């Protein structure tokens, strides 16, 4: 780590914090549930408060649970009602309902605590977070919010080397000076931005990587803008992807095996979920487009030909996409939803097991009229390769009609993940991110020819600042934990 | 040079195990439940009324110093100012022997440019005249002081320290009267009311709690000397005189809450020492006889004139340090007032000049000092034989006209101090001079004595009570009260005296369970 970046992050009188005060979203689950530094000194301010214990430990035990193995659940749903639900017990919860009380001590399920955390949370919002308010504890998350506001920009990033290369520009891997965190860094290089009419792509990934965190989706922590290039630093991952380990885990026997197959999909199935949940469409779901991280989870990324639809806005027009992995609403022009990218689900499930499109053979020269007219009218056949659960769910993502399609329905994939395909995965550790991986991983091209006949105008440079808008706070937060750099400067008396 | 207030190690380690019984040991969970800092909205009047002098806040009030060394310990720029501090005064209470080395590396550690907590703000002069030279380093002190009371101090005031430190204050002020303390014991009996022994109910820390009873107060007309007392054991804080935590008052009875000295006064161990053979041995003797001096020192140096030192009000402490106590006698002199009349004291202590209705000042406490002494050594006073039958005016004339004679149990250095502060004329007599007893110090009585340890309570005593022992032997009519009472009760009553109550918290350890920002 620089230490000239490094000596940059201290925290700052309280004075410089007035101004923030007033200026920033004071609401109870804003500050203290989603963003990671605000929930560490809630908790704190709790832990230092004795009244307020069994509150706090009720609340890290019902997610000690929620994230506990299925061997172990029994005895930590007894452990929770002895210490908590008992007027006797020393950490018993006044607070509650006789109601609330009841039904926690009835019954075993998936979500057995997801009322009574409810409860708790409704509970921690009202006296303990108006005393939060008025506590140091608050004061101090001012000063986080601060540091969190200053300039980041890019003198603060070491970029040492290429991970992969795109239309604009490489994407490089580097270093966030200051914690030494590692991160992706994709460059758009500006002028070639402007002259092939990028803007829009460029923005729309930038808001959406900005807006949603998922664990299934790439995170952007910082965009920022240099002389010649725009900048998304974004999660790094180094894995490669599924296209890659398609054809290179066995050359001469490629696809995946069927677990490993069902695995991404349901990491995949949970990013799409993600997205549409917040009314977007990806428009760009393939193998290509997925990507390993060290730990062999896998991430959607490449979000430029998404589209996000306006408050009551159900459907779109819009062609956009890859060929072969466009669905026929889509392709005949018409009004489509969320149900061409579980059409696009399908064909890439379809290739990770059989190593080859749906509609075309591997390997094949196939230009795109005849591609559309295959997608258009060819029904899928399917190898031995397949089990019959694989087959049915390619079938019912692969069906032509979207109305007949298998996808989002009632704001969730919940019926989805009902169907066989899923029967050995265990939803509820696959989103918390507590299942093993099936498999764990372990050039010089030079620079692009300085774009011709390209200069700015005013509404290029205001594009470009709008682009570049610097530092998202969850992701900022959750580096400075994860590094040691909230430790180090969060100590009282050490 | 102040000391670090630190939580008492074993107090703390007796309190858990005495709060598991459900008998008076405990400490009362009702009192310490009222031990919480408040909201910061509540501080707020706190921030206008409040001295925030540097020296006021940062070096005199225990909580706040302990709270600005915290802000400069996480604040890395302002470390080599508060280890420079820290060491200051480590150096300056070390024993003789390991000074020469802690000297050499405090100037290694901060004095030099090549060094990692070398000290940059310091002049090119106070470096050099540090790397010279007891006194050795009060001028860098002073230099290392008037920095932090700059810029480091200003970063202060806008830290959550400075704001800890005003929920600390606020607390303080908290009413803390009467139902706070326990008396579970007689210490001792006073002309007004008993000295009990208590225990401050939330923390558990032990005090001498004097009761005046206030129908004999005004009907004996007391009052004056009980305020005198008052006033004086709060605004004076030294290691040698009895401090005042809390004043209050009951329906029956006004209340000071006070340093506990359960060792016994010094008269009872002239005479029970060994009833055969009584008196001190010489170093006993000239140890207290130090003590006493440099709590007279502090008196004088405010304008304060004791008038009643003798033995019986020198209490020992369970180390076997004395303190001054009963100060109902004593006067303050006002501003550039040089000396006062007054035919106070008791009988065989009060010098000549008193006595013959003069003009007097310290001059009389030395002769006090001096008859203290003498009794010390040879168990008897300079002016009456032992258990001598001799009324008041025979006592006058003996003060006024008799030369003291020096059986064979004193040494040469021992007749001479004594001689030198019996001196019938003030003129003489040695004593209180150019702000301080530097000169009476200086007396080889007191060869032995090391007097920057003494003054900061490192010394061994010569002699240790022991705690098993108690060092002690075995209505009012018609009065009622118009207002001058109740107003002057009012005024007496005026509560919780800052600094003891700091070093309260600090030492009991409260200070550490409110503080703890993640535990
Ligand atoms: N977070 C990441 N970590 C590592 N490599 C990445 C990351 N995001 C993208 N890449 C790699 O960087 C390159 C660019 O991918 P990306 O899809 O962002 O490019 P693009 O220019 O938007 O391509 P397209 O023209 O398909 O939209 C590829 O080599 C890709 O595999
Ligand atoms: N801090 C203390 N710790 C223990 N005992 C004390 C303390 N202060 C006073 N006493 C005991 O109580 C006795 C009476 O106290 P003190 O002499 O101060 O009261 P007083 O009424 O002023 O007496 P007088 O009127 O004779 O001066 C003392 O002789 C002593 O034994
Ligand atoms: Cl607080
Ligand atoms: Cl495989
Ligand atoms: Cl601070
Ligand atoms: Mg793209
Ligand atoms: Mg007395
Ligand atoms: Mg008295």
């Not at 408050?311 to 890859?322: F, I, R, S």
């Not at 020269?365 to 591609?371: I, R, T, Y």
């Not at 682009?467 to 969060?490: R, Y």
Request: proline share 5%.
């Amino acid at each position: 780590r620089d230490r000239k970046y490094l000596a940059r992050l201290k925290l700052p009188p309280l004075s410089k914090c007035e101004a923030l005060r007033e200026s920033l979203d004071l609401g109870f689950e804003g500050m203290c549930l989603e963003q990671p530094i605000g929930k560490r000194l809630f908790q704190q301010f709790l832990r230092t408060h004795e009244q307020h214990g069994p509150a706090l430990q009720l609340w890290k035990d019902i997610e000690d649970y929620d994230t506990a193995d299925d061997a172990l659940r029994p005895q930590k749903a007894q452990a929770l009602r002895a210490a908590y639900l008992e007027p006797q017990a020393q950490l018993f919860c006044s607070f509650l309902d006789a109601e609330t009380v009841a039904r926690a001590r009835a019954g075993a399920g998936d979500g057995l605590f997801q009322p009574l955390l409810r409860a708790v949370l409704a509970h921690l919002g009202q006296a303990p977070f108006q005393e939060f308010l008025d506590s140091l504890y608050f004061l101090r998350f001012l000063q986080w919010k601060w540091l969190e506001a200053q300039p980041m920009g890019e003198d603060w990033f070491l970029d040492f080397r290429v991970l992969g290369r795109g239309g604009f520009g490489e994407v490089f891997a580097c270093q966030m000076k200051a914690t030494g965190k590692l991160y992706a860094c994709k460059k758009l290089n500006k002028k070639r931005l402007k002259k092939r009419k990028g803007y829009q792509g460029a923005m729309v990934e930038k808001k959406i990587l900005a807006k949603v965190h998922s664990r299934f989706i790439v995170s952007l922590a910082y965009a920022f803008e240099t002389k010649t290039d725009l900048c998304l630093v974004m999660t790094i991952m180094n894995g490669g992807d599924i296209r890659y380990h398609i054809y290179n885990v066995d050359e001469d026997n490629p696809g995946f095996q069927e677990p490993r197959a069902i695995f991404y999909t349901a990491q995949i199935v949970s990013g799409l979920e993600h997205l549409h949940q917040r009314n977007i469409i990806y428009r760009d779901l393939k193998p290509e487009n997925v990507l390993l991280d060290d730990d062999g989870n896998v991430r959607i990324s490449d979000l430029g030909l998404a589209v996000e639809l306006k408050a009551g806005q159900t459907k779109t027009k819009g062609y956009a996409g890859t060929p072969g992995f466009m669905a026929p609403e889509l392709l005949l022009g018409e009004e489509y939803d969320f149900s061409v990218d579980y059409f696009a689900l399908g064909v890439t499930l379809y290739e990770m097991i059989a190593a080859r499109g749906p509609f075309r053979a591997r390997g094949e020269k196939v230009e795109n009229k005849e591609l559309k007219q295959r997608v258009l009218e060819q029904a899928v056949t399917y190898p031995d390769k397949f089990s019959p659960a694989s087959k049915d769910f390619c079938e019912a993502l692969l069906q032509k009609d979207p109305e007949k399609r298998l996808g989002f329905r009632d704001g969730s994939c919940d019926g989805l993940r009902t169907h066989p395909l899923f029967r050995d995965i265990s939803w509820r550790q696959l989103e918390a991110g507590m299942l093993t991986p099936p498999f764990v991983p372990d050039q010089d091209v030079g620079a692009f020819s300085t774009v011709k006949g390209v200069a700015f105008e005013k509404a290029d440079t205001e594009f470009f600042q709008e682009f570049a808008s610097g530092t998202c706070p969850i992701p900022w937060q959750e580096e400075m934990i994860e590094t040691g750099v909230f430790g180090d400067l969060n100590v009282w008396r050490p």
